[PDB]
Amino acid sequence: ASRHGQKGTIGITYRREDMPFTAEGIVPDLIINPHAIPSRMTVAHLIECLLSKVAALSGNEGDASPFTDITVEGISKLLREHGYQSRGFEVMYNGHTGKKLMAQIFFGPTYYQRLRHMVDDKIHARARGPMQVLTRQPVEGRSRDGGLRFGEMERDCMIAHGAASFLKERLMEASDAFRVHICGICGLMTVIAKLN
Amino acid sequence: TLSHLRRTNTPIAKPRQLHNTHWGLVCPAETPEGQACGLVKNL
Amino acid sequence: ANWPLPVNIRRIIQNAQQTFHIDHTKPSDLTIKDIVLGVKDLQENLLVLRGKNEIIQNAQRDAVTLFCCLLRSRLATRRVLQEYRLTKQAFDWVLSNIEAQFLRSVVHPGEMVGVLAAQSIGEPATQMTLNTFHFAGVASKKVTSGVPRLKEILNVAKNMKTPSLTVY
Amino acid sequence: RGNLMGKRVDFSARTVISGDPNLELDQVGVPKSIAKTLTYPEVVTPYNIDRLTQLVRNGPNEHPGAKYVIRDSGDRIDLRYSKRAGDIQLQYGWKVERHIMDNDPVLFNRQPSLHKMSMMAHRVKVIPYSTFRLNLSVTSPYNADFDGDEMNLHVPQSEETRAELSQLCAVPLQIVSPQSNKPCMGIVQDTLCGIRKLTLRDTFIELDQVLNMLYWVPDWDGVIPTPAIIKPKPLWSGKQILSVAIPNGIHLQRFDEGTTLLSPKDNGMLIIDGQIIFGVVEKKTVGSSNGGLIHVVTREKGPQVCAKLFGNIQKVVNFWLLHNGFSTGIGDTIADGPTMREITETIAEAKKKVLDVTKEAQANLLTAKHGMTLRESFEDNVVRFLNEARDKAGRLAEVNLKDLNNVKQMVMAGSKGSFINIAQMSACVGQQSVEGKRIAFGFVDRTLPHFSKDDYSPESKGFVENSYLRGLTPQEFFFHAMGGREGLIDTAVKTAETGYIQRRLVKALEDIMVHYDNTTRNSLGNVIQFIYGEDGMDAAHIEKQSLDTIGGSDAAFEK
Amino acid sequence: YDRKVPSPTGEYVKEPEWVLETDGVNLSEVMTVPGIDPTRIYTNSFIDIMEVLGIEAGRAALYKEVYNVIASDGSYVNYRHMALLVDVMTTQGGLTSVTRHGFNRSNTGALMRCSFEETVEILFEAGASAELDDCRGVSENVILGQMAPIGTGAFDVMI
Amino acid sequence: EGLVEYIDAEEEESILIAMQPEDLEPAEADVDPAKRIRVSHHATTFTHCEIHPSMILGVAASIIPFPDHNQSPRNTYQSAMGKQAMGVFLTNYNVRMDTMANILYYPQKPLGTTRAMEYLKFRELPAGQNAIVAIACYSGY
Amino acid sequence: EKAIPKDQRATTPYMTKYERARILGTRALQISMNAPVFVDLEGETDPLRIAMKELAEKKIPLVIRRYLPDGSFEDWSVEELIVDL
Amino acid sequence: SNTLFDDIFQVSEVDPGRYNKVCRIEAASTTQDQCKLTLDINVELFPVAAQDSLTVTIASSLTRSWRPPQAGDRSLADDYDYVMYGTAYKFEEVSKDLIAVYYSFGGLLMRLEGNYRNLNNLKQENAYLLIRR
Amino acid sequence: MIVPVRCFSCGKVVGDKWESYLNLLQEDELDEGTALSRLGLKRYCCRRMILTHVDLIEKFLRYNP
Amino acid sequence: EEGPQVKIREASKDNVDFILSNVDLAMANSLRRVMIAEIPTLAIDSVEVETNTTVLADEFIAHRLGLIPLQSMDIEQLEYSRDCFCEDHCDKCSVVLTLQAFGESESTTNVYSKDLVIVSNLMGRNIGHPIIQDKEGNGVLICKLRKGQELKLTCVAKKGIAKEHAKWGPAAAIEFEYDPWNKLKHTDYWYEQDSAKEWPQSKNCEYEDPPNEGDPFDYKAQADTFYMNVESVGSIPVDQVVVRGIDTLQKKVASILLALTQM
Amino acid sequence: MNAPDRFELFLLGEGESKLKIDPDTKAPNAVVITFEKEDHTLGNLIRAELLNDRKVLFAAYKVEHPFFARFKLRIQTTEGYDPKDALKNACNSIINKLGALKTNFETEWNLQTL
Amino acid sequence: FDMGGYFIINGSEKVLIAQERSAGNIVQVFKKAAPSPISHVAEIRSALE
RNA sequence: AGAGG
DNA sequence: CGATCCTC
Ligand SMILES: Nc1nc2c(ncn2[C@@H]2O[C@H](COP(=O)(O)OP(=O)(O)OP(=O)(O)O)[C@@H](O)[C@H]2O)c(=O)[nH]1
Ligand SMILES: [Mg+2]
Ligand SMILES: [Zn+2]
Ligand SMILES: [Zn+2]
Ligand SMILES: [Zn+2]
């Protein structure tokens, strides 16, 4: 995540070659999408990037402090003094084909954070497994290889679809199921069945 | 850590709301989502 | 004018035009008899209910009242001729296509509408944002809306919040 | 509630979800490890025996393998330990608990499960890496994004249970929603943005690329279309190669605003025999629109054909855009020197309008109309003048944005953002509210201790003149934060509230179903409706169409 | 208020009209006032409509209201869905609530009512009143772990 | 020396605060269009002045660059988020025996800092890295 | 009793999705359990694909008991039911 | 097949309607007192100014998969400078004797008005536009 | 923690450059901008690598164990 | 000589600035890619840690060692250990470096790439010697030790390409530009007022003639003349990066020619 | 954890062969070669060159999914021209061009001083 | 860099979370709603510090 | 109760 | 007397 409420997972890794590149041969470490910008309305993210680019080039810290007189214009002015286009854009080349891109990419440094709750700490799968003592239903939590909850909300979706046998298997074959002996007179689980 | 040591809890006619009076006293941004939103404050 | 009905007739016409490579500068091969009696006959074939009796026959008649209005408004002589410029071969297929699509458009016994309706109102309910007033510009038209109103409605709340008579 | 209605289940999986432009709509990417855990009890028939022995041979750690062999009596041979794990001489009637393989039906879900579309049968495609991969165009019925969302996966254990999924719960079946009688999945994000960019008149493509774009469509006929331009350089328009993705017999007509039949602005839509004749392709065509390409392709060609369509559209548009490129930067929020002077002027006149109304109010002059306080009226006026200001200032900005403006570009495609965003980001943020009214006097007769008593000015009561580009002042900042907080607070309320509404609605209607006499009845067999929805029609099979006998003049009807 | 009313030529026209909006309900008395259209009169209080004009008008008003919330948001839900809900509350003679008060008090099977709210007490009066559950409801089969009379099992298969 | 005073919300009620020592009180009688609009200091009866308006924020928000250029709630989210981030939490991290300890291999000081970060010791003990980032439609992954 | 006669039957001549799905499941189950195939399985080995072929060829020997809310029913063979869908 | 139409036109207007490679051309026949023409042209390939005299031809020859030119001895029905390929999509009769044809050369539109568009311009995927001088 | 061997983005060996960098400031009374350039660090990906680096190891070695 | 043409503008031990005329985009690009990845080099691939009393972790150290550049001059004379007939490694396929450091001094002891020492028999090949460009002759600062602090490890350096791990990269950054005037109109400049005024003019512009205002767009033109700058880490010298880059590409094309023959 | 070995990018597995030549289903005289443990370095290079051949009617490559290091090349030639031949011709041209480049760069390098 | 201000209880580091309350001995007046027979109410939550 | 959407 | 999903 960037310092602007812009959390997101890695979608894929590309090695240096496959990445788009600047004519300097600079390449991204990250590729964030333009679509997560207009709605989120996080302009400081864009300002940060511009500020950081000037900062890296000039070798001077970027003043990102709030109630200041630092203007996008002032920053833009300095970046051009460093011979890059004023608004952070950069002509980029496709790493596959080598061809230029019709778009000039807004590219520069940005402080991104690594957050806890990484894939492998979350990935869980269960076939058969440990059953609870009282309920006789699959246990809870991945640590003890537990069963994921097929709640009532999920039950409803299945009812909607009209998948009666799936819903039956999901509540019997999978999870629970049990064979009880009942009286054809009182109907209670009294029957003291001496099997075999 | 610093953030955790500056936390405020408000138990229980609109406490969740950022009151004018909070200016310079409690942080306007910092607050959890949903659950204790506007009840858990930060100095 | 525009209301949700089964069988998109407009498309069927457009499809027939392309399928039969309709020549707009040629006289068709139908009769006033073909069109007029054709639609009249297609109407009888648009089945929802199937009981041999008068109660169910009226039930059927009622269920298609609106669709038939469309069917007839669209497939009337003048239009079939000067507008659509259809041919007997093309027109007949339209009648079979309408019947087929209509029959496909019908509900299936087993379709769990209870859950469906509930979820169909319930999911859009969750998507409701900043619900206090959005149906206001002045101060006179400031009535309780969104989830708090929907709650009033479902609870059949004896003690409302914005009781309002609108006198014409 | 939690042990009978709902319960923890076997043959289930969960992990973080991720986007995949190379997976089919109806597929789901399943990590090898997850595939290696979940099994399916297959009975040994002569039809399978050769695949089944080889699968028992691969064992529990090589992928297309198995975990258990069940035989006579019902004894489980554990392939991970058994001394005969490499011996096993299969017999018919025996079962082989095999690893979930490519193309198996699975139930894929995102919680909360508010829709029948939050639960969908997917085709397994075993993949490397740890995320559940999914086609971007299935994002919406699930209400998923990839910011860290996790999804659940359930495996059918019976031949009849797999059918239920593949024949009822399948993703292509789900395309046309019964909820709103319109489809529930369309061309979203990059592909939506790119499809607009590709479909412009200006967008022309050449042989080298054209050939790649064509090969990229799997259903490709293998016939190079004749370039719209044969003269110096054979040049294909974007519209052209994209019509390759559209199947034959697809006819679609629109007519936007200006739209003639000679479509001067390249607006509206005309597709004949599945070839785009005119009109730029964007949300209206390719989104989850009622009269959209998707509703048409589903109805005409079929669900499975339409599901394939999403794939082809994506493959082309994606490839094209991957090579074209698209960005968004700070420059895209910057609007003209003269525009800035004009937005400032717009706010300044609103500032005057308010001050004049205030001066008027203070002279005991203004007479409020019947029904409202002399003060109540004052605020409507001010707040109105101030919204007018923001909106007018915003429309000024939008107008100054070029056709090359990446924000304008996304809005135009309908891929992301609205007007308000342009307005707040570049022109002016606007008036902040809490409980309907503008910022209130929390301090005695002032909103902040930086103001004088009894100050009713735009600024004093939460009016943010600055845009996000310009930056907000501390007063603006705090006021915005007050308004912002209300959002987060009610979001918390609304989501908790609506969830309870849903459980009630569901529990109240649960047992209502259409019977074998078209009658909508409950468990007790009581009639709720005599014909479902007063017409005995299924909601998915219904569309808005104009009743031509109702409108126009009597002369116009006569003609 | 603005109104679409047909012109002498036949075409519909935007003929604007004067409409009064009230704070508070006394439907019973306002409709008997001269100079008004008692045909057209309306209240957001569908319960008053129910009492003054009958259950059918109640249903009509109850829908008009439910719809209004859905469209207020900007969203659209097919008529039939809201029509179903509205009809459910309606078919009873009066207005049955979408809470433990309304539908959870109804003649339904004991096991499907204990699935919603007031779980323990619903089953307590089931034993006291000596209730007989039909087991044809969704929830009953869900508890019993049998194939429910839902879509797929709403008919029997034979040779 | 009575150059500064401690004020609570109760006393706050009776005072008049200027936001800037300068901009809020020198003299009165060209401009920078890029700079934000600031209302003319019409009230001139000040009893106090703000040490710095940025001081309205606390620890987590004090980490955000330009929060003043952000939509109100994105500032709220980043606040909760930065507490889910990795880095040197302390120098003695490998002298302590604690459940869960996540430390960034090569943590770097943000190229864009707030003045408040000086006291928050952020550059001394950081939470992220200065990634070279591109806002682009690439493979659509 | 209760049984409605073959003539005088008001239910759809068409097979519901729910009927089709259950029929396909029940047959696919039998195929997968070494029960005989009533059609030429030209190239096919998938129990559902085989049931699908069997349905398309109308050599599925199963009948649907259509219950009505009064308790009465209507029996319809897979051979007789129209398969549009 | 062979030609279906040929005439010399006079450029009225040239409009880059928010386009930077395409232009909408407004033309009139040098012979006919009623014959109109509205057409989209790639003004990057064939730059068109004001009142330029243009020979505009509609043909149907010189379905089958496209083979690159890559043959010197291959001779196409042009000594022309600008050649397009389109589809017929509408045939609006502009009252009495006046008829208009609608051609889309891959989304580059054309509208030709007149009288004698008879046993020559039919609803055809066949449509070749040829411009001269 | 300690001066990364090689720039993440580009690969240019930044490992050897650190002592040299500190000295350049301390002794040669230079500023970061010239100091980075004087070490041949031209691309900004290489620049952030050294400029933004916080050397936690010096504090760490301060602990006796 | 015949096809592709080279013109070296500038050259040093670490960078080569040259123009590549009479070439197609694919070749220029495919050469840039092959330089990044596909060229084999020698890097530390296995670390045995006998002793580590440093503040740094075993694998954090092991990681850096991998990134130390080693003499990859005679790399084609070394086998990939996967093709070697030994049990694990040997001298035909690997180089063994040793590192022993102990903070004897009170003052913080620095552990350099210079401090690594070959123990393998190099059989007279310019291989495995850490690349030292640091003027003080130290190279990479692997680690810092206090006083008690000891570090005892043994590392096997193996042959490999960047396509497996970015440590095997001999190059780093390749500057690459074609048509500095956008005569090709291969890009579309984003602007506020004037594209020419708003975009900085490329250094290669003086190597090409401007478009001349009122000239029609050259539709037929294809890009041929690619302004490049190949930089090296020092494992292999610059001339080799490009020569071996070319050579590898030839080799992989030649395997396809050969694969058609076994078919 | 679920990530496959980096050598899987360039090393052929058991049963895996480099080129897999399949006759195109639709078009006449067209072929589809699956290239194993290769990317855009080879794909774009062969494809670009095949276009320089006048008797090549169609030539296009694709890498169906990034996870896997393989590419598909579809080639169509004129009647009597086998695409396997148009491929080997394209391959040989590439080699020759590269030869000259190596030679020319080497020559240039020997003329420079530093 | 440690700031202190926490407790160490059985090796675990504890933070005493500042608790919000209304100040006592404060006179506040409340307009009571429509059904009650009392128009307004004057309160004081007195205590001994 | 701590956090994740 | 109830108050959205998930795990730890
Ligand atoms: N339908 C739709 N929703 C959007 C659009 N843009 C943003 N949103 C929504 O705006 C909200 C804010 O984005 P997020 O910060 O990711 O919301 P979140 O992931 O649920 O995290 P929380 O803020 O804790 O709720 C989410 O509900 C998004 O789905 C849009 O263009 N269309
Ligand atoms: Mg999310
Ligand atoms: Zn008994
Ligand atoms: Zn670098
Ligand atoms: Zn060896």
Q: Are C147 and E32 in contact (CB under 8 A)?
A: no
Our count of domains for chain I comes to: 1
Residue with nearest Cα to nucleotide M3 C1': F84
D contact residues 309-328, partner K, Cβ 8 Å cutoff: none
3-state secondary structure of J102: strand
User: What's the domain range around J138?
Assistant: 41-166
Within 10 A of A106 (CB to CB), how many other CB atoms are there? 29
The spacing between the Cα labelled CA in D147 and the C1' in M5, in angstroms, equals 9
Rounded to whole angstroms, what are the CA distances from I65 to J54, J145, J146, J153? 9, 12, 10, 20
Nearest CA distance, B4 vs chain L (angstrom)? 8
Range of the domain at I58: 1-65
A148 touches strand N (CB under 7 A): yes
**Do residues J195 and J189 touch, judged by C-beta distance below 8 A?**
yes
Strand N nucleotides, any atom under 7 Å to a protein CB: 1-8
The domain total for chain H is: 1
* Distance, CA of F113 to CA of A148 (rounded, Å): 44
Cβ(E139)–Cβ(D5) below 8 Å: yes
Q: Are C142 and C136 in contact (CB under 8 A)?
A: yes
User: Is the dihedral angle over the CA atoms F73, F79, F85, F87 positive or is it negative?
Assistant: positive
| Chain L touching partners, 3 or more CB pairs below 8 A | B, F
Chain C touched by D380 (CB under 8 Å): yes
Taking CA–CA distances from G49, the nearest residue in chain D reads D163
Look-up of token digits 């930077």: H20
Query: Which of chain F's residues have a Cβ under 8 Å away from the Cβ of B31?
Result: 76, 79
Measured on CA atoms in the order K88, K94, K95, K100, is the torsion positive or negative? positive
Inform me whether the C-beta atom of residue J147 falls under 8 Å from chain A C-beta atoms: no
- Which ligand has an atom closest to residue A186 CA? 3
What 3-state DSSP class applies to H11? Answer: strand
Protein residue whose Cα sits closest to atom 32 of ligand 1: D416
- Spacing, Cα D250 to ligand 5 middle (Å): 64
Dihedral angle, C-alpha H78, H81, H84, H89, nearest 10 °: -100
H21 with D263: Cβ contact below 8 A: no
User: Sign (positive/negative) of CA torsion C57, C62, C67, C73?
Assistant: positive
Residue whose CA lies nearest to ligand 1 atom number 31? D416
Residues K102 and J2 sit within 8 Å (Cβ to Cβ): no
Residues with Cβ < 8 Å from D258, sequence gap 6 or more? D264, D265, D267
* d(CA E118, C1' N1) / Å: 8
- Put simply, whether F124 touches L (Cβ < 8 Å) is yes
Judge whether F134 and A31 are in contact, CB under 8 Å: yes
Q: J67 phi and psi, to 5 degrees?
A: -80, -10
Q: Which ligand 1 atom lies nearest to the CA of residue F73?
A: 23
* Range G12-16, long-range pairs (CB < 8 A, 24+ positions): G12/C50, G12/C106, G12/C109, G13/G80, G13/G81, G13/G82, G14/C103, G14/G81, G14/G82, G14/G83, G14/G84, G15/G64, G15/G76, G15/G78, G15/G81, G15/G82, G15/G83, G15/G85, G16/C108, G16/C109, G16/C110
**Contact between D232 and J190 using a beta-carbon 8 Å cutoff:** no
In this complex, the residue with its CA at the shortest distance from the C1' of nucleotide N7 is A141
> Which of J166, J183, J202 marks a domain boundary?
J166
Are J228 and J238 within 8 A, CB to CB? no
Coil, helix or strand at residue L5: coil
Residue H67: closest CA among K31, K54, D244: K54
Asked if E146 lies within 8 A of A168 by C-beta distance, the reply is: yes
Q: What are phi and psi of G75, to 5 degrees?
A: -95, 125
Q: Select from A11, A17, A79, A22 the least CA-distant residue to A46.
A: A79
User: How far does the CA of residue G16 sit from the closest CA of chain C (Å)?
Assistant: 6
Say whether A162 and C116 touch across the interface (CB within 8 A): no
Q: Is J93 annotated as a binding residue?
A: yes
Do residues D97 and D82 touch, judged by C-beta distance below 8 A?
Answer: no
Question: Which nucleotide minimizes the distance between its C1' and the CA of A153?
Answer: N5
Q: Which one, of J159, A117, E75, H101, lies nearest residue D181 by Cα?
A: E75
Question: CA–CA distance from D70 to each of A178, D41, D89, J231 (Å)?
Answer: 20, 9, 12, 63
Measure the CA–CA gap between E51 and E95, rounded to whole angstroms: 10
Query: What values do phi and psi take at D556, rounded to 5?
Result: -65, -40
Rounded Cα distance, D210 and D223, in Å: 12
Asked whether the beta carbons of D253 and D303 are under 8 A apart, the reply is: no
- Is the C-beta of residue A13 closer than 7 Å to nucleic acid chain N? no
Ligand 1 pocket, CB under 6 A: A 39; B 33; D 145, 147, 416; F 77
The bridge status of strand D12-19 relative to strand J109-112 is: unpaired
Measured between alpha carbons, how far is residue J147 from residues C16, F96, I1, I64 in Å?
92, 21, 19, 9
Start-to-end Cα distance in chain B: 13
Q: Which CATH number covers residue H108?
A: 2.40.50.140
| Sign of the alpha-carbon torsion through C99, C101, C102, C107 | positive
Please provide the size of chain G in residues: 85
- Solving technique: X-ray
Q: Which residue is listed with tokens 């128009």?
A: L39
D462: left (phi over 0), alpha (psi -120 to 50) or beta: left
Check if residue A146 sits with its Cβ under 7 angstroms from strand N. yes
> Do the beta carbons of residue K42 and residue J163 sit within 8 Å?
no
User: In chain M, which nucleotides are within 7 Å of a protein Cβ?
Assistant: 2-5
Give whole-number Cα distances, E77 to D540, E98, H39, in Å.
Answer: 12, 18, 44
Q: Output the DSSP codes for D407-422.
A: HHHHHHHTSS--HHHH
D8 CA – M3 C1', rounded, Å: 22
Query: Which amino acid appears at position C20 of this protein?
Result: F
Q: CATH number, domain at J249? A: 3.30.1360.10
Q: How far is the CA of J101 from the centre of ligand 5 (A)?
A: 28
Q: How many other C-beta atoms lie within 10 A of the C-beta of residue D334? A: 22
CA distance C61 to C52: 13
Q: Which residues of J touch I (CB under 8 A)?
A: 55-56, 60, 64, 67-69, 108, 110, 113, 131-136, 138-146, 148-149, 166, 169, 171-173, 231, 233-234
Q: How far is the alpha carbon of H10 from chain D, nearest alpha carbon, in Å?
A: 20
- Shortest CA to C1' contact from A146: nucleotide: N7
CB of D488 lies under 7 Å from some atom of strand N: no
Q: Any atom of strand N under 7 A from CB of B11? A: no
Bridge partners (DSSP) of residue A111 are: F130
Delineate the domains of chain K, giving CATH numbers in brackets.
1-114 (3.30.1360.10)
Does residue K47 contact residue K61 with C-beta atoms inside 8 Å?
A: yes
Helix (H, G, I), strand (E, B) or coil at D78: strand
Find the ligand nearest to A41 CA: 1
Is the N-terminal amide bond of A60 cis, ω within 30° of 0? Answer: no
Q: Under an 8 A CB cutoff, do A88 and D324 touch?
A: no
What CATH number has the domain bearing residue I44? 1.10.10.60
DSSP J86: S
Q: Is I45 annotated as a binding residue?
A: yes
G and I touch with 3+ CB pairs <8 Å, answer no
> How far apart, in whole angstroms, are the C-alpha atoms of residue C57 and residue C63?
10
Which-ligand-closest: CA of J87? 5
Q: Are residues J188 and J81 in the same domain?
A: no
Q: Write the burial class of residue H118 (CB in 10 Å: 0-12 exposed, 13-18 middle, 19+ buried).
A: exposed
| Resolution for this experimental structure (Å) | 3.2
Other C-beta atoms lying within 10 Å of the C-beta of residue C118: 29
Which ligand 1 atom is nearest residue D149's CA?
19
Query: Which residues of chain D lie closer than 8 angstroms to K28, CB-CB?
Result: none
Q: Which among F122, A43, D428 has a CA at the least distance from the CA of A51?
A: A43
- Please tell me whether any atom of strand N lies within 7 Å of the Cβ of D499: yes
E strands in K67-106: 70-77
Beta-bridge partner residues of H132: H55
- Give H60's DSSP letter: S
User: Is residue D112 reached through a cis peptide bond, with omega within 30 degrees of 0 on the bond before it?
Assistant: yes
CATH 3.30.420.10 fits G1-85, yes or no: no
Tell me which residues have their CB within 5 A of the ion that is ligand 4.
I 7, 9-10, 12, 43, 45-46
Please report, for residues C165, E16, E61, E124, K5, the alpha-carbon distance to residue E2 in angstroms, rounded to integers and kept in the order given: 17, 4, 21, 57, 70
Cβ distance of A120 and K66 shorter than 8 Å: no
Domain with A156 in it = 131-196
Question: Burial code of E108-127, b = ≥16 C-beta within 10 A, e = fewer?
Answer: bbbbbbbbbbeeeebeeebe
Task: Nearest chain H residue to D221 by CA: give it.
Answer: H65
Nearest neighbour of E151 by CB, restricted to C111, C135, C146: C111
How far is the centre of ligand 3, averaged over its atoms, from the C-alpha of E129 (Å)?
22
CATH of the domain at A157: 3.90.1800.10
Indicate the number of domains in chain J: 2
Give the residue numbers spanning the domain of H51.
1-133
- H70 to K27: CB separation less than 8 angstroms, yes or no: no
Residues K20 and J262: their CA atoms lie apart, in Å, by 12
Does J92 sit behind a cis peptide bond, omega within 30 degrees of 0 on the bond before it?
no
Within 8 A of J63 by CB-CB distance, chain F residues are 105
**Ligand 1 mutation pick, D17, D145, D416, max ligand atoms within 8 A of CB:** D145
Q: Which residues of B touch D439 (CB under 8 A)?
A: 20
What is the CATH architecture assignment of D189-324? Orthogonal Bundle (1.10)
